[PDB]
Amino acid sequence: MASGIVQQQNNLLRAIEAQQHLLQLTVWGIKQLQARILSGGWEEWDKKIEEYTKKIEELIKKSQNQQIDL
Amino acid sequence: MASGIVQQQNNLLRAIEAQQHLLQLTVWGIKQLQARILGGWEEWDKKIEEYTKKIEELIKKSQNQQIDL
Amino acid sequence: PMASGIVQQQNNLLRAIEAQQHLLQLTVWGIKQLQARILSGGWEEWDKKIEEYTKKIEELIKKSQNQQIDL
């Protein structure tokens, strides 16, 4: 039971990690399309993207560190 | 250590919350680019809202139960 | 801290991840639709990598489902 729960936590984190890598790709796609515009809130959007990207990366790192905190 | 397992459940949830914020930022980005146009987009709005409502419900459920732990 | 409580919540986290995955696939649809308007380069490789990780997380989701049943 205890090992199964831990194993499930490990599985969930990996799904989250894979979700994030999948998020990184979607962000690239939007920024690539936005770069075509030569002629509106993107500068604030850019900062929020950087904001939550870092926050997620820390939470993933924190989750990884928790695996050895027993 | 069952003090870490509760903590790890909290960590995953927070990561999920933050990834939901990032997802919503991507939705805004798509809608911005889409607004520069002029099928699908009306239905796309409906399904974006639908699953956003579904995620927000599951997060609330997970948050409350995180406290019961 | 009942073990059934953690297991219960792990089910929700999994359901949340599954729902967020469906939301993400809806965003991929939106991007590809806008990208299709380009007639002028990363996008062929972008498709390959969206494809690669979509399958990868789906494996992890399926693996999480079968673990959830073993709990």
Numbering used by the authors:
A (entry chain C): 544 to 581, 622, 626 to 656
B (entry chain A): 544 to 581, 626 to 656
C (entry chain B): 543 to 581, 622, 626 to 656
Q: What text appears in the publication on this structure?
A:
HIV entry into a host cell requires a critical membrane fusion process mediated by HIV envelope glycoprotein (Env) transmembrane subunit gp41, a direct target of HIV fusion inhibitors that are usually adopted to treat the AIDS patients without response to other antiretroviral therapeutics. Most of HIV fusion inhibitors against gp41 are peptides derived from the helical C-terminal heptad repeat (CHR) of gp41, including a number of currently experimental drugs and T20 (Enfuvirtide, Fuzeon), the first and only gp41-targeting anti-HIV agent approved by the U.S. FDA. These CHR-like peptidic inhibitors in helical form are capable to specifically bind to the homotrimeric gp41 N-terminal heptad repeat (NHR), interfering the formation of a NHR-CHR six-helix bundle (6-HB), which has been proved to be the key step leading to the virus and cell membrane fusion. Finally, by introducing an innovative C-terminal tail of Ile-Asp-Leu (IDL), we succeeded to increase the anti-HIV potency of a CHR-derived peptide (Trp628~Gln653, named CP) by more than 100-fold. Unexpectedly, the crystal structures of CP-IDL in complex with NHR helices at different lengths (N36: Ser546~Leu581, and N43: Val539~Leu581) show that IDL tail is capable to bear two different conformations: a part of an α-helix (with N36) or a hook-like structure (with N43).
To explore the exact binding mode of the artificial IDL tail, we first determined the crystal structure of a fusion peptide N36-L6-CP-IDL, where N36 is a NHR peptide widely employed in the structural studies of HIV-1 fusion core. Unexpectedly, well-defined electron density shows that the whole CP-IDL folds into a continuous α-helix, which can be perfectly superimposed to the C34 peptide in 6-HB structure, despite the significant difference between their tail sequences (the counterpart of Ile-Asp-Leu in C34 is Glu-Lys-Asn). By forming almost one turn of the helix, the isoleucine and aspartic acid residues of IDL are located at the outer side and hence have no interactions with N36, while the leucine residue participates in hydrophobic interactions with Ile548 and Val549 from two adjacent NHR helices, respectively. The interface area between one CP-IDL and trimeric NHR is 1098~1218 Å2, where IDL tails contribute 66~124 Å2 (approximately 10%). In addition, we noticed that, “below” the N-terminus of N36, there are plenty of space allowing more residues from NHR to interact with IDL tail, of which the structural features cannot be unveiled by the structure of N36-L6-CP-IDL. IDL was designed to target N-terminal hydrophobic pocket (NTHP), which is mainly composed of Leu544, Leu545, Ile548 and Val549. But N36 (Ser546~Leu581) trimer does not contain the intact NTHP target. As for N36-L6-CP-IDL, even one of the six helical IDL tails is missing in the final model.
